[PDB]
Design an enzyme around this catalytic site. Structure first.
Site, PDB file in Angstrom:
ATOM      1  CG  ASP A  80      39.048  44.755   7.247  1.00  0.00           C
ATOM      2  OD1 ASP A  80      39.550  45.364   8.225  1.00  0.00           O
ATOM      3  OD2 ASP A  80      38.083  43.953   7.350  1.00  0.00           O
ATOM      4  CG  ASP A 105      40.263  47.029  12.034  1.00  0.00           C
ATOM      5  OD1 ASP A 105      40.442  46.837  10.810  1.00  0.00           O
ATOM      6  OD2 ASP A 105      39.200  46.702  12.655  1.00  0.00           O
TER       7      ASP A 105
END
Ligand SMILES: CN1C(=N)N[C@@](c2cccc(-c3cncc(Cl)c3)c2)(C2CC2)C1=O
Length: 390
Positions: free
Chosen positions: A36, A232
């Protein structure tokens, strides 16, 4: 390809996230961990949960250290509570090093774990500024670089299959690569182009122009980065600020107007299906995002296809049709270049040089007529004005 031990070390998909195998504790406990780039905590399931078949057992680790502090982390789409500590952590298909890192042992959660995702925790790869509870909790990658000779850089190749993977297939399929400490030349084609990391918190970038099939969206460029633009891996979609989303969807609808799709499709809620092999890729436009370059007054562009922004999903009738969801959606927190965009590119998070590189991915999905692209340079003036300031 100079990083064979790390190539093909990811599994997963855009809808559920991409994960890497890690070990925690002594003796090592194996866990699958979501990669992440949109958060900065290393947080792992540490108690039984209906969606977990394994979790970190601190009492079984001789190297576990309790920091005697809780952490409460609420997100928009869920939350969790945990206990902070440190332990020895390794990445089996990674650099051959073991480091002492902070670990948030998740003891309670709501809408955090995903049924069938196959991961048991998250590896927040962004900067300490956005770590919870505060910036004193050193993120994993900062620990790794401080304790070893691993270069301060990582790169991600997320590989979308281009079709749905069933439960068995998604477990047996290669989802991509996370190269820790380097760039593997086998993972991309053409040249790498770099955009500055505007500020070290999220991986923040500046978009300076947007085109739909070459047609300029023609908005004030500050709108594209209101209130930030980030890269992201932990968001599925390409998310755009409300006003940008409205203009982009209008233009994508106009370009694809030979077929009419229901409102629910454009809202990213309902799937659309076509007879097997007949998806009309050619009616959908390409999307180009121009990013600030490293040289004054220079930009470059990344171009994605509908094979990236239409996310393959299984039909409600498990039919033989080819079905998809529209993976572009609105945001009130800025642009998010999520997994479906990253699937077109090999993305280099060059923390050492405060820049993000993009190149066409060797595993991007395309057709015989169009491919994703990374091209430049373009002359672009006053790019600094594209950045938003509160
Ligand atoms: C936007 N975002 C992240 N970048 N990571 C989070 C997260 C947490 C749990 C699961 C997922 C996730 C689920 N499905 C698909 C993906 Cl790609 C990721 C993401 C959170 C830590 C901040 C989240 O909400």
């Amino acid at each position: 390809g100079s990083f064979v031990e790390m190539v093909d070390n990811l599994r997963g998909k855009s809808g559920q996230g991409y994960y890497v195998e890690m070990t925690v504790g002594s003796p090592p406990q194996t866990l699958n961990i979501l990669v992440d780039t949109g958060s900065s905590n290393f947080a792992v399931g540490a108690a039984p949960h209906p969606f977990l078949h394994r979790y970190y057992q601190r009492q079984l680790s001789s190297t576990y250290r309790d920091l005697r502090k809780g952490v409460y982390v609420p997100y928009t789409q869920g939350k969790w509570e945990g206990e902070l500590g440190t332990d020895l952590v390794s990445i089996p298909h990674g650099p051959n090093v073991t480091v002492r890192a902070n670990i948030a042992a998740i003891t309670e959660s709501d809408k955090f774990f995903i049924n069938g995702s196959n991961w048991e925790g998250i590896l927040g790869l962004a900067y300490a500024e956005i770590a919870r509870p505060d910036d004193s909790l050193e993120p994993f990658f900062d620990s790794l670089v401080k304790q070893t000779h691993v270069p301060n850089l990582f790169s991600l190749q997320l590989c979308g299959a281009g079709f749905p993977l069933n439960q068995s297939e998604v477990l047996a399929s290669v989802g991509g690569s996370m190269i820790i400490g380097g760039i593997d030349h086998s993972l991309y084609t053409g040249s790498l182009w770099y955009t500055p990391i505007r500020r070290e918190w999220y991986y923040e970038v500046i978009i300076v122009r947007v085109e739909i099939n070459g047609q300029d969206l023609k908005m004030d460029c500050k709108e594209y980065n209101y209130d930030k633009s980030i890269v992201d891996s932990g968001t599925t979609n390409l998310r755009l600020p409300k006003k940008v989303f409205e203009a982009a969807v209008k233009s994508i609808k106009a370009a694809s107007s030979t077929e009419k799709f229901p409102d629910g499709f454009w809202l990213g809620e309902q799937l659309v299906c076509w007879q097997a092999g007949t998806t009309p890729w050619n009616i959908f436009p390409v999307i180009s995002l121009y990013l600030m370059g490293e040289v004054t007054n220079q930009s470059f562009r990344i171009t994605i296809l509908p094979q990236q922004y239409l996310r393959p999903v299984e039909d409600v009738a498990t039919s033989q049709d080819d079905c998809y969801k529209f993976a572009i959606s609105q945001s009130s927190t800025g642009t998010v270049m999520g997994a479906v965009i990253m699937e077109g590119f090999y993305v280099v998070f060059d923390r050492a040089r405060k820049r993000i590189g993009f190149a066409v991915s060797a595993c991007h999905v395309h057709d015989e007529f169009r491919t994703a692209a990374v091209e430049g340079p373009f002359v672009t003036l006053d790019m600094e004005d594209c950045g938003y300031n509160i």
